[PDB]
Amino acid sequence: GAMVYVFSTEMANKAAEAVLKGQVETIVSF
Amino acid sequence: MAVYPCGICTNEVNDDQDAILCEASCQKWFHRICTGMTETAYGLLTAEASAVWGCDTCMAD
Amino acid sequence: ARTKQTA
Ligand SMILES: [Zn+2]
Ligand SMILES: [Zn+2]
């Protein structure tokens, strides 16, 4: 897609751990 | 005489090392380990076609 | 994201 989602290291680390637990959702804002 | 000095440690970022580009702003390469990124986060960011990463300095700005 | 693992 055209959208680009920007991760810090902290956010990527947290997201990764959550993904393993089957929690894959993140709420878009700006 | 690096071509891609790591944004953190300044040592060359080689193709056979886990490393990520700060596409968010500064466009430096960074060794995964230098950034404190886990192997899993690194694999996730690789797999995410629509995701980009920014280094701590760039994200703070 | 662009990494060294990127195909
Ligand atoms: Zn480094
Ligand atoms: Zn940066």
Residue numbers in the entry:
A (entry chain B): 174 to 203
B (entry chain A): 338 to 398
C (entry chain P): 1 to 7
Provide the publication's sentences verbatim:
Pygo and BCL9/Legless transduce the Wnt signal by promoting the transcriptional activity of β-catenin/Armadillo in normal and malignant cells. Therefore, this is a prime example of histone tail binding by a PHD finger (of Pygo) being modulated by a cofactor (BCL9/Legless).
We subsequently crystallized the same PHD-HD1 complex with an 18-mer histone H3 tail carrying both K4me2 and asymmetrically methylated R2 (R2me2a) (Kd, 2.1 μM), and solved the structure of this alternative ternary complex (Tern2) at 1.60 Å resolution. The latter is virtually identical to the structure of Tern1 (with an rmsd for the Cα backbone of 0.16 Å) described below. In both maps, we observed additional electron densities in the predicted histone-binding pockets of hPHD, which allowed us to model the first seven amino acids of the histone H3 tail bound to the hPHD-HD1 complex. Interestingly, although R2 forms two H bonds through its backbone with L358 and with the carboxyl group of the invariant E360, as well as hydrophobic side-chain interactions with L358 and W366, its charged guanidinium group protrudes from the PHD surface into the solvent, and adopts multiple conformations in one of the complexes of the asymmetric unit of Tern1. The same is observed in Tern2 (data not shown) in which the methylated guanidinium group of R2 is not able to assume a stable conformation, due to lack of molecular contacts with the PHD finger. In fact, there is no discernible R2 pocket in the Pygo PHD finger; instead, the long hydrophobic side chain of L358 protrudes into the groove corresponding to the R2 pocket in other PHD fingers, blocking access of R2's side chain and redirecting it into the solvent. Taken together with our binding data that revealed insensitivity to R2 methylation, this implies that Pygo PHD fingers recognize equally well histone H3 tails that are methylated or unmodified at R2.
